[PDB]
Amino acid sequence: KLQSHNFNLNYNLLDRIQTHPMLLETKPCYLSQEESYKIIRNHIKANINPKFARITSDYDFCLTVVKVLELYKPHEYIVDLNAMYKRRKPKLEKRFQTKREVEIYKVAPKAYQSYPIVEPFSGKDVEDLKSNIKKFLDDLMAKINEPLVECKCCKGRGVILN
Template identity: 40%
Template sequence: MDIFGIKTDSGYYITGNLRADSYRSGSNLTGYIINGGKPQETFHRDWLWVGSEPKEVKKIVRQPNINHRFELMSDSFASSDIPQVMPKHEIMEENEDGYCGWKEEFKHLQSLYEEKSDKQPDILEPVEFTYTTILEVPEIKITEDFAYGGIVSQDDIQHQIIDKIIFPDIVLPNKPSKLTSYKSYDIVRNHIKQNINMDVSKITSDYDFCFTVKKKVILSNPRHVKNEILNARGRPYTKRRYREYYVKEREVEVFEMTYSPKCYSPYTPIRGFTGKNHQNLQKNIDKYLKEIMEIINTPLKDCHHCDGMGVIIAEA
């Protein structure tokens, strides 16, 4: 057995599955006794933790049950012809089909008995192994599985090729991380849809390839509109009819995006989120989403001094 470890100031992270590329693969050292105790589980399912360098490895070997027998279900049935206990090998036999059943002379007693046996304690068997320390770091910061809004998971995060070559995956959450433009598009699109104030802004394009948000700007002076109503043939009525109303707001585009490499024209491809590590990546995403929602959800109105050439923040 080959065991690989990462030495830290507090102990060793160990695995027997060094090439695992999934956080859900599971450790193949589970069930072994190392240095006299069971290794502790860590945040990464393929890596376990021990307090010192592995010097002794034993495996738990389950032992078969012994003393197989049949006992009376009720002591009141016991008599000279109905014993309290009957050894299994004395009353059962294997037929020509390989099925083990009660012998003919005991079948009439079968309903009175229940099968029992005694468990044996497990034993520990020494295991030959080699141990290699592949990395030494002061600590490995515990990271939770990265998940964002049910859209992005740990598996969607990308790392530098050189880091993936040099470092085992338990260390990668502490290395530079990034998301693709497409995954970043999904995060932003979903967050805006869930948090937009529809009284202030509205989504005018919502597709897998492009997304637009427009702000509702309150006019300083409502604009009177008068439109003629036409008949079913698109012609004016003999007696002219009109529909009059006031426009109280105008729309201004405040956010639009697509993603690369699709780059749906004329939309702007969003850049993929990046971070110094998973934690920093999460922080940068949260910061961006907070800032964009402040822009989208801040109510605006035309400046009455310049008649709509500028806008001011409206009171909520």
């Protein structure tokens, strides 16, 4: 059946000596750090529903996807365009917003700002590693594709399945 894997993988330095290279695939393995982040970033770009969630910052060093939820009543509030400066007189302006965006998932291949570092993918077998990647990949996608309407009974607060 062979490895049949496009992505490269690594093994423990100590346990390689006693084994054979052809027998390395069945032994426990872990994926690379940047490789793990690259896999997650590439799948997210291809799989997220644009309506349900929006990806704000995708970079080689950071990744942020936020959840877009629509408030049934169009939210209206007042903003100040002079709020960045204290001395001059305030000037008010009306703004209507309908899609309130909340941060859901964010990750980085390495320590950058406050982003959480992605953990490397690990598996006892190359196919076991693939299943672990697939299961976690589907879990993340499922969190992204959660439906989004706000409660009429529960004004404000959060979301209800739809």
